[PDB]
Design a protein around this motif. Sequence first.
Motif, PDB file in Angstrom:
ATOM      1  N   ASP A   1      -1.235  -5.826   2.297  1.00 21.51           N
ATOM      2  CA  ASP A   1      -0.654  -5.372   3.521  1.00 21.51           C
ATOM      3  C   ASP A   1       0.635  -6.199   3.917  1.00 21.51           C
ATOM      4  OD1 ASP A   1      -2.389  -3.386   4.144  1.00 21.51           O
ATOM      5  OD2 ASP A   1      -3.932  -4.983   4.540  1.00 21.51           O
TER       6      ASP A   1
ATOM      7  N   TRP B   1      -5.595   6.547   5.860  1.00 22.04           N
ATOM      8  CA  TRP B   1      -5.016   5.325   6.364  1.00 22.04           C
ATOM      9  C   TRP B   1      -5.555   4.943   7.451  1.00 22.04           C
ATOM     10  CZ3 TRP B   1      -1.162   2.027   5.364  1.00 22.04           C
ATOM     11  CH2 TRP B   1      -0.340   2.204   4.310  1.00 22.04           C
ATOM     12  N   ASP B   2      -6.501   5.816   8.230  1.00 20.39           N
ATOM     13  CA  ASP B   2      -7.597   5.610   9.159  1.00 20.39           C
ATOM     14  C   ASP B   2      -8.177   4.306   9.193  1.00 20.39           C
ATOM     15  OD1 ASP B   2      -6.381   8.033   9.706  1.00 20.39           O
ATOM     16  OD2 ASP B   2      -7.823   8.837  10.981  1.00 20.39           O
TER      17      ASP B   2
ATOM     18  N   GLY C   1      -2.803  10.110  13.802  1.00 24.84           N
ATOM     19  CA  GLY C   1      -3.032   9.767  12.383  1.00 24.84           C
ATOM     20  C   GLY C   1      -3.929  10.660  11.615  1.00 24.84           C
TER      21      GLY C   1
ATOM     22  N   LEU D   1       3.013   6.407  10.512  1.00 19.72           N
ATOM     23  CA  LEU D   1       1.570   6.487  11.071  1.00 19.72           C
ATOM     24  C   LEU D   1       2.016   6.912  12.617  1.00 19.72           C
ATOM     25  CD1 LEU D   1      -0.268   3.277   9.833  1.00 19.72           C
ATOM     26  CD2 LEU D   1       0.105   5.670   8.836  1.00 19.72           C
TER      27      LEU D   1
ATOM     28  N   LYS E   1       6.010   4.491   5.045  1.00 17.51           N
ATOM     29  CA  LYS E   1       4.560   5.404   5.438  1.00 17.51           C
ATOM     30  C   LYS E   1       4.784   5.605   6.941  1.00 17.51           C
ATOM     31  CE  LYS E   1       1.141   7.760   5.883  1.00 17.51           C
ATOM     32  NZ  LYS E   1       1.087   9.208   5.647  1.00 17.51           N
TER      33      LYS E   1
ATOM     34  N   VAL F   1      -7.554   1.893   7.015  1.00 13.80           N
ATOM     35  CA  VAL F   1      -6.428   1.047   6.712  1.00 13.80           C
ATOM     36  C   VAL F   1      -5.851   0.436   8.063  1.00 13.80           C
ATOM     37  CG1 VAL F   1      -4.826   0.092   5.275  1.00 13.80           C
ATOM     38  CG2 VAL F   1      -6.540   1.540   4.396  1.00 13.80           C
ATOM     39  N   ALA F   2      -5.056   1.198   8.488  1.00  6.63           N
ATOM     40  CA  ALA F   2      -4.094   0.823   9.673  1.00  6.63           C
ATOM     41  C   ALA F   2      -4.042   2.084  10.701  1.00  6.63           C
ATOM     42  CB  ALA F   2      -2.554   0.626   9.264  1.00  6.63           C
ATOM     43  N   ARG F   3      -4.541   1.974  11.952  1.00  3.55           N
ATOM     44  CA  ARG F   3      -4.805   2.672  12.850  1.00  3.55           C
ATOM     45  C   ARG F   3      -4.043   2.534  14.225  1.00  3.55           C
ATOM     46  NH1 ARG F   3      -9.081   6.316  13.885  1.00  3.55           N
ATOM     47  NH2 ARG F   3      -8.448   8.037  15.209  1.00  3.55           N
TER      48      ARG F   3
ATOM     49  N   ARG G   1       0.781  -1.403  -0.072  1.00  4.72           N
ATOM     50  CA  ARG G   1       0.119  -0.113  -0.050  1.00  4.72           C
ATOM     51  C   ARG G   1       0.785   1.103  -0.036  1.00  4.72           C
ATOM     52  NH1 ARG G   1      -5.175  -1.939   0.548  1.00  4.72           N
ATOM     53  NH2 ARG G   1      -5.285  -3.524   2.223  1.00  4.72           N
ATOM     54  N   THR G   2       2.052   0.957   0.739  1.00  2.00           N
ATOM     55  CA  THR G   2       2.882   2.462   0.888  1.00  2.00           C
ATOM     56  C   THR G   2       3.756   2.464  -0.637  1.00  2.00           C
ATOM     57  OG1 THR G   2       4.863   0.922   1.707  1.00  2.00           O
ATOM     58  CG2 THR G   2       3.039   1.878   3.204  1.00  2.00           C
TER      59      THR G   2
END
Length: 211
Positions: free
Chosen positions: A71, A50-51, A46, A42, A40, A53-55, A35-36
């Motif tokens: 991922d 991306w929230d 955040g 985080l 990236k 996706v990955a938090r 994805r990056t």
Amino acid sequence: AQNITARIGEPLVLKCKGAPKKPPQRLEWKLNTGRTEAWKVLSPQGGGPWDSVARVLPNGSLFLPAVGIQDEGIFRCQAMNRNGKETKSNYRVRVYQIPGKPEIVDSASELTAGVPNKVGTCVSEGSYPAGTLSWHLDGKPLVPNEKGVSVKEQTRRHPETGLFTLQSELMVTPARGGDPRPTFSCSFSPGLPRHRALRTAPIQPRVWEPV
């Protein structure tokens, strides 16, 4: 790096070693996945695409609601225990998907000893990573280029899901005076031992003699 394996669609939580149990925390996750575009970063707050996706959680752990092929990669957390105690976390994430049960198509009702015959084609759909198909004769595995035994394999990736479709066509030259009622079967074996092999229903063709 610690290796993590999650099933596609399943949630994933990555612990941040040495991070305060409660906010506010001095930490940053930096990941390099499909994805990056590169690395990236985080932050605990955040904010962006991306929230969803990955938090980063209140306790500092990285949370992925549903992991996908995109991922897979490296997840690193650099946390700051109050001060200036610092702890690193290194994760290598790989995902997997179990295909449906393998099916045999275009199987031969009969075949002739002494000459090459098309036994059948094994088909497996919806697997990640690809994996391999393997034919068996009465329990024992068959090996290509040996005694008229050959296979015609091909692997195909779905343009959207990224999942794989496997095809294996078996060809054998049966020995005259050999077993008139042999049993063939195809098995799917995944890349990593995340699950047990999946085996087709057996095909039981007749072996006739040439005139």
